[PDB]
Design a protein around this ligand. Sequence first.
Ligand SMILES: [As]
Ligand SMILES: [As]
Lengths: 244, 244
Amino acid sequence: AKPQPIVAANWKCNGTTASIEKLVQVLNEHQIDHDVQCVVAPSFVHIPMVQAKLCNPKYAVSAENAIAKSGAFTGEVSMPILKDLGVSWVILGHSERRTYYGETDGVVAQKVADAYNQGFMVIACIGETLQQREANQTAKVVLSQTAAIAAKLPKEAWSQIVLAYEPVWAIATPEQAQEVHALLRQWVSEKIGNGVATKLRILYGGSVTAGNAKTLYMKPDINGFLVGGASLKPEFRDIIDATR
Amino acid sequence: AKPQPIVAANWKCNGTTASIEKLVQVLNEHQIDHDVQCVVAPSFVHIPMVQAKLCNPKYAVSAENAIAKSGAFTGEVSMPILKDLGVSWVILGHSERRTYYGETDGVVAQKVADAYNQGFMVIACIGETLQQREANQTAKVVLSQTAAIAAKLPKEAWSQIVLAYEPVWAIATPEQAQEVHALLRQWVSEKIGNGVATKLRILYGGSVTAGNAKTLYMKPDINGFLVGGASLKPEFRDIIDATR
Ligand SMILES: [As]
Ligand SMILES: [As]
């Protein structure tokens, strides 16, 4: 029933040359025996070393953010630059960028559309804060965020979209995760179409560990993970193996 | 009289693998016959290729921005990451980040202090908008920006600081540039000390071309350049040679 799972590592703003060499060697030696798309998103300056040292073809390298256009945007990295470098995945709308770096719903929606139209696979992040959840606004918020993205996309774009639900309010039980994933998928099914909804990967982006990954993946509407801190450790392999 | 000049290339969010290979080969073949510190600031994902292909020891590689701390800051690059990668220069406070990416005077001042305390050479950018210049507030603005930076630095930090004046209102005659540079240096001399003021490099960050570089460098308070678009072209070499 489920579509191909994805296990994505978000290294955030972490790593050294030495630590990444060691971690990538562990990922390269891991023999994955089922159909899963693995993604690694290093900090921008580590993308080249990861591209060079990774040899496991079940992985793609992602950026952790991008802007749409090259030009006079000191400090930023654009989608054309990433494409020329051979990066075809990007994480957009991460809660830390929505919170700290001014990415409103509209800003994220436009970036996702720009990444779609430039050929990227996009992990688009959504999720509600503690104040929003306490106000009983979980559904209003995650469906407003998703709707904003959807309004700028044609139906055919959804083959390049992956959603990641971040329970910002926690950063949650597997049951609470499943409730939001099911709501997201039912809204896509109604508004966009049931074929899009059954093929869409909705990844869980709360706290994922070797301890809890299999329990989360048992949920019918969870299609893998956007992993934070545990993705810097050898137990990331156990999180991949939890999607069998 | 003048301190060692600096000619810094800010590539902004521009370049391809192919274009950078070609440009770096031109910079590597250029024989520089006087004492000048050259800097190249590529987009983050191009830092490694530039570090590898550059062979001209008169150049240092810079970042175009950074944050102070590693951690859960998706999409950002930190000063410890850059140091581990061997980057010891950073541009902070560029007008495009102050304008588009929420860097207030306080935010820039704190980053400069954090980069000082982590051992970086810092090109700290200041400059007034068209509305501020029309209000006759050039001096209020560039000295407020500089004062905000200075308030977080001990006197000994100034060996690691370089100022870059950006005439945002234009982006200017060499005379207008010299007036602001002279004002900046006189304020540093009074507030911080005359030995700091005579050793400080104040770089001009308006439109610098092969056509105008020597005329600008003739000005007594201009110590080189933070160059935009012309730094992507072979005529960057002519801008370096204008600091003889
Ligand atoms: As291999
Ligand atoms: As050489």
